[PDB]
Amino acid sequence: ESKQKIHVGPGELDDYYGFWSGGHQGEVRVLGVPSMRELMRIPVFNVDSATGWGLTNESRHIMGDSAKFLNGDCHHPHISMTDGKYDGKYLFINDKANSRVARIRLDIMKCDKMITVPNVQAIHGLRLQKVPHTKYVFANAEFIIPHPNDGKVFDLQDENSYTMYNAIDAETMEMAFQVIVDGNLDNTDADYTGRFAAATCYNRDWVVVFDIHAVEAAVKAGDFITLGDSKTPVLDGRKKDGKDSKFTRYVPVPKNPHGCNTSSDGKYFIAAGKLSPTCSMIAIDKLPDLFAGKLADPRDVIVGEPELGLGPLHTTFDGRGNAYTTLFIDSQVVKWNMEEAVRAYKGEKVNYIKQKLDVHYQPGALHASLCETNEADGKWLVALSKFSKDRFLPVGPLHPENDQLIDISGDEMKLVHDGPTFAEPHDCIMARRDQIKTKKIWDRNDPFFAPTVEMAKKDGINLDTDNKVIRDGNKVRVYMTSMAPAFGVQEFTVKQGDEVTVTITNIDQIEDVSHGFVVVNHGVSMEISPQQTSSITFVADKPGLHWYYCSWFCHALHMEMVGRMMVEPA
């Protein structure tokens, strides 16, 4: 019987971390599960006034040139794995809007790396290699574009118009390789060996299967081209006059397949039918024979095609042998047994459908706890539905997404909580509490602000102790420690037009004692947590006295942790 506790009362703690995509708002969100409360916001592609992400020098360095963009469009959060189990190291997420992949360090809960994927448009589907560990992040670029895209050729049917499958080195966050494909890429997942990955494609469509070992072999042998000014190795996984690449096989699957999900037992890539009221089950164990040319037809790797309902979009797994698929049109989650569907495909009279649960309304993605791992525990399911209609109080023309928590621990799915969320997160990922280990206090050697430590060294500054103003032409570099309730530099004087950099090192050793730094009427704001160094650059374009203050309540005398910038007129 499905009978888990859903109430986390005061003083009790949640059992799982939930990492939510920030949707069109561009951040990542940390929730407690089963309470479904938001514990933290992690800025990624958004500009965060609170912490200064997008304003500070540390964040803009990580964002690189893409720091000029104030927007992102997220869908697919995933956690790094070792031996097919979450290892708690990194979270990765896509940006469809400006074609990026971001990495979040789960010990500090900050974005620490970001890459603009070269020569593509719109990074949408994203999942991680599972085995032996997450060596690659796999990222779909959705839209076909000309190559080069220099304005001479606009024809999307041109032989050099295509999109590409993208592999990013998870640890260095540099491109590993790109594979040109036929069609548009939708979603993607990886097997439990490291050899295979797959993606659904549109524009009978197909699942494209990648022999990653073959791609890697060709990269090591130098058998690749490069595109534009990117050194990324580029392999051609397209068909040519009906001849296959060594890198890809195209498996025909009903029109416009959508979700592409690897079962936790490693047996299946499951492509959701969308327009077809079905899912197609690709047997991963038959893929070696497919690439060796031992099979008669690419369709032979299909071992199941359960008929489930109207509008199947995504599938997840309880680790007990059941799959759970969203039905967008029927507005349900359908629970079905995978091995029984396989036997049905062979012609046996067996009902593989176990239950349909109405959800509210029009579900897109769904996620069961630990479903992307061989430890899928079958305890919780989140279905993320697009049209909340009357499930929450009206709040004007815009509506929240309805992310519904479902107890799947027993034979019967039970709906237990409706969670409204902002800007359509689309998908989420859960981890056991003991799978995530966070720092309470920053390490002074942390790579996040290591470039700022290096700049301080060029100025002769010991960030742990010093309170000094460095003059350098029209550049002014203030360095200070902060200890509640006092800034280490409480006043400084500059010339109108000077470019001011303020570097603050929080030397409080008490956990949870955050400081802020805001320069009034200059658009300057940032947070500095214990033992962190943060810095921000602005031009003092207004003569006169200009106050700065600590924004984060840190002390009974917080309101008086302030300072003065005096700007002498030109």
Binding site for Na ion (CB under 5 A): 115
Q: What are the C-alpha distances in Å from 48 to residues 105, 306, 450, 463, 501?
A: 18, 45, 21, 25, 19
Smallest distance from ligand CUA to CB 491, Å: 16
CA distance 139 to 124: 7
Closest to 268 (Cα-Cα) out of 315, 310, 206:
315
Smallest distance from Ca ion to CB 537, Å: 34
Q: What mask of x and - would describe binding to its own copies in positions 358 to 377, judged by CB under 8 A?
A: --x-x-x-------------
Q: Which of residues 4-33 bind its own copies (CB under 8 A)?
A: 7, 9-11, 13-14, 17, 23-26, 30, 32
Return the structure tokens found at 64: 């690189």
Tokens 């032989």 map to which residue?
159
Smallest distance from its own copies to CB 76, Å: 14
- Cis preceding-peptide flag for 420 (omega within 30 of 0): no
**Which residues touch 172 (CB under 8 Å, ≥6 apart)?**
none
CA distance 59 to 47: 10
50 contacts its own copies (rule: CB under 8 A):
yes
Residue 150, Cβ neighbours under 10 Å: how many? 8
Find the binder of its own copies among 49, 355, 467, 474 (CB under 8 A): 49
| Residue 554 near which of ligand CUA, Ca ion, Na ion, none (CB within 5-8 Å, type-dependent) | ligand CUA
Smallest distance from Ca ion to CB 144, Å: 13
> Which residues are 334's β-sheet partners?
325, 356
Q: Which amino acid is at 265?
A: D
* Residue placing its CB nearer to Cl ion in the complex, 91 or 218: 91
Q: Which of residues 232-271 bind Ca ion (CB under 5 A)?
A: 256
355 contacts Ca ion (rule: CB under 5 A):
no
| Residue 205 near which of Cl ion, its own copies, Ca ion, none (CB within 5-8 Å, type-dependent) | Ca ion
Find the binder of ligand CUA among 127, 258, 515, 546 (CB under 6 A): 515
CA distance 195 to 470: 55
Options 208-216, 246-254, 476-484, 542-550: segment touching its own copies (CB under 8 A): 542-550
Options 68-76, 337-345, 385-393, 545-553: segment touching ligand CUA (CB under 6 A): 545-553
275 contacts Ca ion (rule: CB under 5 A):
no
CA distance 537 to 446: 21
User: Which residues of the shown chain bind Cl ion in the complex (CB under 5 A)?
Assistant: 187, 259-260
164 contacts its own copies (rule: CB under 8 A):
no
Q: What are the C-alpha distances in Å from 431 to residues 6, 19, 26, 135, 428?
A: 16, 8, 21, 20, 10
Closest to 137 (Cα-Cα) out of 181, 88, 182, 91:
91
Return the structure tokens found at 39: 């514990």
* Residue placing its CB nearer to ligand CUA in the complex, 216 or 401: 401
529 contacts its own copies (rule: CB under 8 A):
yes
| Residue 360 near which of ligand CUA, Cl ion, its own copies, none (CB within 5-8 Å, type-dependent) | its own copies
Closest to 512 (Cα-Cα) out of 537, 493, 529:
529
Q: What mask of x and - would describe binding to Ca ion in positions 179 to 218, judged by CB under 5 A?
A: --------------------------x-------------
Smallest distance from Cl ion to CB 260, Å: 5
Say if CB 15 and CB 432 are below 8 A apart. yes
Say if CB 538 and CB 522 are below 8 A apart. yes
| Residue 415 near which of its own copies, Cl ion, Ca ion, none (CB within 5-8 Å, type-dependent) | its own copies
| Residue 73 near which of Na ion, Ca ion, its own copies, none (CB within 5-8 Å, type-dependent) | its own copies
550 contacts ligand CUA (rule: CB under 6 A):
yes
509 contacts its own copies (rule: CB under 8 A):
no
Find the binder of its own copies among 146, 194, 252, 266 (CB under 8 A): 146
Return the structure tokens found at 193: 């060996």
Name the 3-class secondary structure at 560.
helix
CA distance 463 to 460: 9
Task: Determine the length of the chain.
Answer: 570
CA distance 546 to 494: 11
488 contacts its own copies (rule: CB under 8 A):
no
Options 12-20, 29-37, 380-388, 548-556: segment touching ligand CUA (CB under 6 A): 548-556
Degrees (nearest 5) of the Cα angle 382, 40, 501? Answer: 145
| Residue 550 near which of ligand CUA, its own copies, Na ion, none (CB within 5-8 Å, type-dependent) | ligand CUA
Closest to 332 (Cα-Cα) out of 352, 312, 306:
312
| Residue 556 near which of Cl ion, its own copies, Na ion, none (CB within 5-8 Å, type-dependent) | its own copies
State the residues that interact with Ca ion by CB under 5 A: 205, 256
State the residues that interact with ligand CUA by CB under 6 A: 484-485, 515, 550, 552-555, 558, 561
